[PDB]
Amino acid sequence: HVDEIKEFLHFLTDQFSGQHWLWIGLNKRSPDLQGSWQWSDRTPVSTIIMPNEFQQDYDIRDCAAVKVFHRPWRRGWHFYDDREFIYLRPFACDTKLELIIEGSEYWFVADLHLNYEEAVLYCASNHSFLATITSFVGLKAIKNKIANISGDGQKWWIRISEWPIDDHECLYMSAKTWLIDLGKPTDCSTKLPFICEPFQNKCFLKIKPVSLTFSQASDTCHSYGGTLPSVLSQIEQDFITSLLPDMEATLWIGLRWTAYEKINKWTDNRELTYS
Amino acid sequence: NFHPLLVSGRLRIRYHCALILNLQKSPFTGTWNFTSCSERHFVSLCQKYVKYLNNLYKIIPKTLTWHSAKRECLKSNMQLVSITDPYQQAFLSVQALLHNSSLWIGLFSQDDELNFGWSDGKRLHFSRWAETNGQLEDCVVLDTDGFWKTVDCNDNQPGAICYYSIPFQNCCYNFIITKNRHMATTQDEVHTKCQKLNPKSHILSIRDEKENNFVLEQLLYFNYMASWVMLGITYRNKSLMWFDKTPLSYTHWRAGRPTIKNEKFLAGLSTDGFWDIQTFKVIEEAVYFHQHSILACKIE
C-alpha cells in the first residue's frame, strides 16, 4: 500500500543525507502490461504512484524512479524520472519474509555470563527469542530495571529497533548514558548477562498464458493489480467458465493448504459460504 | 558415533534414516550417514542376547617391558604391532578387550616425540590419537576406548602382541601454526591479512579439479590434532560466495539448496571430497579455525 512506500521513503530520507537516484521499485519493462502496472513478488498494485509524461522515446526508457531529498519532510512530493535497464550497479536488495508496561515479560539472566551466540542458542526456544525493544517507554522501563537489578557498569545484549524484527549486528546496551551507545556495536565475544523474551463490485484482468510452477504462479498476476481468483458465488463460476473458451484446460485457481487438513480463507481474506 | 563432518548439527527449525558407510580402507572407516530410507540397501549384522586379513598375530600374557617383549617374541621371527589399517586397529582393540588388559604396541621416534613412525617403513596413512596434552614421552599404548595413549612404555603391561605380514598448478600455499583468539568480525580481515604478506595474494579459490586431491594428500602429514578442513566460503553479498569480487563456478553444496542468512558458517571438506556445510550457533568451533588448521591463500 501507500503506507509502505511512505515508510520506505521515511527510512531512506532519515538515515541518509545526500540526494541521489539509487532506484525505486517501479517497472514498466514488458510490453504486455497493456498500460497497467506490474510487480515481481506478491504485490498487487492499488495506489497511484506512477504519473504519465510524454516523451519521444517513452516506450524505451522503462524504469521509473522518484527522488529522495535532504529534507526530513517528503510527503509524496518527489521528482519523477524514467531511465533504461542496461546499467550495472552492485547489489542493493530486499527479500520477502514469508509485567512491564507496553510489552510482555522479560526474562533477565543473572550469574550466567554468556556471549551473543550462546545467548541466542540457549535462551531462545519454541516460544522464546531475543527480546528486542520497539518503544521508548519500554526502553526506559528496561533501563530502570537494569539499574535496579545489576547496576550501571554491566552491559546487556539488547536488540534495538523500532519494529519487531523476525528471526526468519552484535548490539549492546549499558544502563549509564544509553544515548551514545544506541547503535554502536562492539565485539560480542564477551561473557555478559542479557535479557530474553465486469462483475458487480469486482473486476478481472488476464495475462499471458505462460506456464510456471504454483510457487512461482502466486506472483504472475499478483504483479498486476489483483489477487488469484476466489469463487464466492455461482455467478463467478459462470463467468470463469464463460472466459474459459480462449484458455487451455488447466487453470491455477490459486489457493494453498497443507494436506490432511482444512482450507482456510482462500488466502485472500474471503470467508467460505459453500464449496 | 557421529563424526562432525557429514551431519549438520544446529537449532533445527520426508523421513530420515541412518546408515554406516565404508570408504575402501579409509582412516575414518565406519562413518554414519543419513538419507531417505525408501531405497534398498544391505544389512548384515543382527544382535541377539591367529590369522586375520592376510596377517598373522601372536599374543603373550607375560609381564615384560617393550625392549624385553620385542627380544622375546622376536626369536620366533615376529615384529611388534604397527597399526596402519582401520580393520587392523579394530581387531587389535577387540582382542585387547577380550584379554581385558592394555597390551604392548611397537614403534619408536627419533627427536623428542616429534616424528613418530612404525617399524615397517610405510608412509603414515592412519591417525587415531587420543589427546593433545598427553604427549609426555615418545611411546604409545592402546587403551580401552580404542585410542592411542601417548605414554612411556618402559614399564610392565600384562601382555604384548607382535605380528607378521608449496607450488602446485600456478599457485603457492602456506601453513600457519600460531595461537589466535580473534572471535569477531571474521569476514573483512582475511583479505588484508594475506595481502600484507606479499602482493598478489588472494584467498584459496578452486579453479581446477586436481587441487582437491593434492591438498587432501598434503593434509595427512601433521594431523595429530587436525581433523577438520576449512574453506573460504562465507556470507558475501547476501549469498554463499568467496571473499573476492568474483562469481562461483564449482558448486560446493551438499544437497537441496542452502539458505544460510547468517554472517558466517562452516564450509568443511570431507575425507573423500563430500561437500559439506554446517550452520553454527556457538562459536566454540574455532580450534579448528585458525590455530592448527589450513590457512592457505594462493599467490598465482
Short mmCIF file of all heavy atoms in Angstrom, two decimals, chain B residues 37 40 42 57 76 78 84 100 105 109 157-158 162 180 185 191 199 206 246 248 276 281 284 289, unseen atoms left out:
data_model
loop_
_atom_site.label_atom_id
_atom_site.label_comp_id
_atom_site.label_asym_id
_atom_site.label_seq_id
_atom_site.Cartn_x
_atom_site.Cartn_y
_atom_site.Cartn_z
N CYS B 37 15.33 -43.48 3.63
CA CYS B 37 15.45 -44.93 3.66
C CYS B 37 14.35 -45.65 2.91
O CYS B 37 14.03 -46.80 3.24
CB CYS B 37 15.50 -45.42 5.12
SG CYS B 37 14.00 -45.13 6.08
N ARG B 40 16.83 -49.23 -1.30
CA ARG B 40 17.22 -50.58 -0.92
C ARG B 40 18.72 -50.63 -0.65
O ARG B 40 19.52 -50.26 -1.52
CB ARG B 40 16.85 -51.59 -2.01
N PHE B 42 21.85 -52.79 2.19
CA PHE B 42 22.20 -54.09 2.74
C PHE B 42 22.20 -54.06 4.27
O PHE B 42 22.41 -53.02 4.89
CB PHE B 42 23.58 -54.53 2.24
CG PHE B 42 23.88 -54.12 0.83
CD1 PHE B 42 24.84 -53.16 0.56
CD2 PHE B 42 23.20 -54.70 -0.23
CE1 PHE B 42 25.11 -52.78 -0.74
CE2 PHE B 42 23.47 -54.32 -1.53
CZ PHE B 42 24.43 -53.36 -1.79
N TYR B 57 49.12 -62.83 13.87
CA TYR B 57 49.33 -62.15 15.14
C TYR B 57 49.64 -63.17 16.23
O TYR B 57 49.17 -64.31 16.18
CB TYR B 57 48.11 -61.31 15.54
CG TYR B 57 47.69 -60.30 14.49
CD1 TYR B 57 46.81 -60.65 13.48
CD2 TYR B 57 48.18 -59.00 14.52
CE1 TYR B 57 46.42 -59.73 12.52
CE2 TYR B 57 47.81 -58.08 13.56
CZ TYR B 57 46.93 -58.44 12.57
OH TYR B 57 46.55 -57.52 11.62
N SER B 76 60.95 -65.90 17.47
CA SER B 76 60.10 -66.62 16.53
C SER B 76 59.90 -65.88 15.22
O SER B 76 58.95 -66.18 14.49
CB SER B 76 58.74 -66.91 17.18
OG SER B 76 58.82 -67.98 18.10
N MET B 78 59.15 -62.50 14.58
CA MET B 78 57.92 -61.73 14.68
C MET B 78 58.26 -60.28 15.00
O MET B 78 59.25 -59.99 15.67
CB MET B 78 56.99 -62.30 15.76
CG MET B 78 55.51 -62.06 15.52
SD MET B 78 54.93 -62.96 14.07
CE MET B 78 53.19 -63.12 14.43
N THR B 84 48.26 -49.75 10.84
CA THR B 84 48.28 -48.99 9.60
C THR B 84 46.92 -49.03 8.89
O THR B 84 46.71 -48.29 7.93
CB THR B 84 49.38 -49.51 8.66
OG1 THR B 84 50.58 -49.73 9.42
CG2 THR B 84 49.69 -48.51 7.56
N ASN B 100 41.20 -58.25 28.32
CA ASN B 100 40.96 -57.42 29.50
C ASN B 100 42.26 -56.83 30.04
O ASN B 100 42.58 -56.95 31.23
CB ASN B 100 40.22 -58.21 30.58
CG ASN B 100 39.58 -57.31 31.62
OD1 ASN B 100 39.36 -56.12 31.38
ND2 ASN B 100 39.27 -57.87 32.78
N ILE B 105 52.29 -52.16 22.05
CA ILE B 105 52.29 -51.86 20.62
C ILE B 105 53.65 -51.27 20.27
O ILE B 105 54.21 -50.48 21.04
CB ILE B 105 51.14 -50.90 20.24
CG1 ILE B 105 51.24 -50.50 18.76
CG2 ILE B 105 51.13 -49.68 21.13
CD1 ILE B 105 50.07 -49.67 18.27
N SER B 109 60.40 -43.29 18.10
CA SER B 109 60.60 -41.98 17.49
C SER B 109 62.09 -41.63 17.50
O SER B 109 62.93 -42.42 17.94
CB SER B 109 59.78 -40.91 18.22
OG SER B 109 60.44 -40.48 19.40
N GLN B 157 53.32 -54.09 31.29
CA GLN B 157 51.92 -54.34 30.96
C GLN B 157 51.63 -55.84 31.02
O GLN B 157 52.54 -56.66 30.90
CB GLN B 157 51.59 -53.80 29.57
CG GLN B 157 51.54 -52.28 29.48
CD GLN B 157 50.44 -51.67 30.33
OE1 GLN B 157 49.43 -52.31 30.62
NE2 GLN B 157 50.63 -50.41 30.73
N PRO B 158 50.36 -56.23 31.20
CA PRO B 158 50.06 -57.66 31.39
C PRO B 158 50.19 -58.51 30.13
O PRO B 158 49.80 -59.68 30.15
CB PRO B 158 48.60 -57.64 31.89
CG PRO B 158 48.36 -56.24 32.35
CD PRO B 158 49.18 -55.39 31.45
N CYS B 162 52.68 -59.19 18.83
CA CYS B 162 53.56 -58.94 17.70
C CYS B 162 53.05 -59.70 16.48
O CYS B 162 52.51 -60.81 16.60
CB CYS B 162 55.02 -59.33 18.02
SG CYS B 162 55.24 -60.88 18.92
N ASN B 180 45.78 -17.91 18.14
CA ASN B 180 44.95 -16.74 17.92
C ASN B 180 43.72 -16.81 18.82
O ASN B 180 43.33 -17.87 19.30
CB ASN B 180 44.51 -16.63 16.45
N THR B 185 34.21 -10.44 13.79
CA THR B 185 34.47 -9.80 12.50
C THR B 185 35.44 -10.64 11.66
O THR B 185 36.54 -10.21 11.31
CB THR B 185 34.99 -8.37 12.70
N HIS B 191 41.41 -10.94 3.77
CA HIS B 191 41.99 -10.34 2.58
C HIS B 191 43.19 -9.47 2.92
O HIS B 191 44.29 -9.66 2.38
CB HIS B 191 40.93 -9.53 1.84
CG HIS B 191 41.45 -8.83 0.62
ND1 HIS B 191 41.92 -7.53 0.65
CD2 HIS B 191 41.59 -9.25 -0.65
CE1 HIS B 191 42.32 -7.19 -0.56
NE2 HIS B 191 42.13 -8.21 -1.37
N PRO B 199 52.41 -9.00 -2.18
CA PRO B 199 51.44 -8.57 -3.18
C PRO B 199 50.99 -9.73 -4.05
O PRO B 199 51.67 -10.75 -4.19
CB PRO B 199 52.21 -7.52 -4.01
CG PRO B 199 53.34 -7.09 -3.13
CD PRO B 199 53.70 -8.30 -2.32
N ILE B 206 39.14 -22.48 -5.82
CA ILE B 206 39.23 -23.72 -6.58
C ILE B 206 38.83 -23.42 -8.02
O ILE B 206 37.65 -23.19 -8.32
CB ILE B 206 38.36 -24.83 -5.98
CG1 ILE B 206 38.89 -25.26 -4.61
CG2 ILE B 206 38.30 -26.03 -6.92
CD1 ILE B 206 38.25 -24.53 -3.45
N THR B 246 34.21 -12.04 -7.27
CA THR B 246 34.22 -12.98 -8.37
C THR B 246 33.11 -14.00 -8.16
O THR B 246 32.90 -14.45 -7.02
CB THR B 246 35.56 -13.70 -8.50
N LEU B 248 30.96 -17.67 -8.46
CA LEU B 248 31.30 -19.05 -8.20
C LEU B 248 30.91 -19.93 -9.39
O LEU B 248 29.84 -19.74 -9.98
CB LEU B 248 30.59 -19.55 -6.93
CG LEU B 248 30.86 -20.99 -6.48
CD1 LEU B 248 32.35 -21.30 -6.51
CD2 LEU B 248 30.28 -21.23 -5.10
N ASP B 276 30.31 -30.21 2.23
CA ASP B 276 29.58 -30.16 3.48
C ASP B 276 29.50 -28.73 4.00
O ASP B 276 30.50 -28.01 4.02
CB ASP B 276 30.23 -31.06 4.54
CG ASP B 276 30.19 -32.53 4.16
OD1 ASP B 276 29.11 -33.01 3.76
OD2 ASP B 276 31.23 -33.20 4.27
N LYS B 281 25.69 -22.33 15.73
CA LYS B 281 25.03 -21.48 16.71
C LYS B 281 25.95 -21.03 17.83
O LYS B 281 25.68 -20.01 18.47
CB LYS B 281 23.82 -22.19 17.31
N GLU B 284 32.22 -21.90 19.52
CA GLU B 284 33.20 -22.80 20.11
C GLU B 284 33.59 -23.91 19.14
O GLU B 284 33.57 -25.09 19.50
CB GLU B 284 32.67 -23.39 21.41
N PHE B 289 39.91 -23.46 13.70
CA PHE B 289 39.68 -22.44 12.68
C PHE B 289 40.94 -21.71 12.26
O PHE B 289 41.12 -21.43 11.07
CB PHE B 289 38.63 -21.42 13.15
CG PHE B 289 38.06 -20.59 12.04
CD1 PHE B 289 36.99 -21.06 11.28
CD2 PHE B 289 38.57 -19.34 11.75
CE1 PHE B 289 36.46 -20.30 10.26
CE2 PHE B 289 38.04 -18.57 10.73
CZ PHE B 289 36.98 -19.06 9.98
#
